Design a protein around this ligand. Structure first.
Ligand SMILES: Nc1nc2c(ncn2[C@@H]2O[C@H](COP(=O)(O)OP(=O)(O)O)[C@@H](O)[C@H]2O)c(=O)[nH]1
Ligand SMILES: [Mg+2]
Length: 174
């Protein structure tokens, strides 16, 4: 091959990232890198003044590892499959709220994004107005697709669009 293009699936839990990726991939190669993170507490008896206070002092573990894991996830990423759930308004707003926080880098250093409304095969459950979603896409001048990981609707179409953005970005930047 000639190129290694790194893509990321972002979005809330239960949105369909893992199912979308497996739908598109159509193979079983999926190497995993897991770590443990945790919380805990300790206790101490303490007499205030009269009063017998019971102290719980909480703490966290494994955060350093988690950061390396996060960095490793974003390292050299060229496209984000930014997805939400058409049946979940909360998934849509979280995306919009997330986007409003991104800081622009130089044109070439900016990663491409495709906005993805997943679970298009359950119209009876839809919460996300189409017009609202297209406007978010319009706002940040990005493509928008309504996809289904179960049917395969626009799954291949959305990914190849992201590739095309990435590839056309290179042509200009090289
Ligand atoms: N009907 C329907 N269900 C989906 C679709 N994509 C994912 N799901 C279901 O939604 C649940 C959450 O999906 P999952 O990929 O595990 O969410 P993730 O946390 O984003 O990775 C799973 O039980 C999937 O079967 C879709 O396009 N249509
Ligand atoms: Mg998942």
């Amino acid at each position: 091959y000639d190129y290694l293009i790194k893509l990321l699936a972002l979005g809330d839990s239960g949105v369909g990232k893992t199912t979308f990726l497996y739908r598109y991939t159509d193979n079983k190669f999926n190497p995993k890198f897991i770590t443990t993170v945790g919380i805990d507490f300790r206790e101490k008896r303490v007499v205030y003044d009269a009063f017998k206070v019971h102290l719980q002092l909480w703490d966290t573990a494994g955060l350093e590892r988690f950061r390396s894991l996060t960095t490793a996830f974003f390292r050299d990423a060229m496209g984000f499959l930014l997805m939400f759930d058409l049946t979940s308004q909360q998934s849509f707003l979280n995306v919009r709220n997330w986007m409003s926080q991104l800081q622009a880098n130089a044109y070439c250093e900016n990663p491409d994004i495709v906005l993805i409304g997943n679970k298009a095969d359950l119209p009876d459950q839809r919460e996300v107005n189409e017009r609202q979603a297209r406007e978010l896409a319009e706002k940040y001048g990005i493509p928008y697709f309504e996809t289904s990981a179960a049917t395969g609707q626009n799954v291949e179409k959305s990914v190849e669009t992201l590739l095309d953005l990435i590839m056309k970005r290179m042509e200009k930047c090289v």
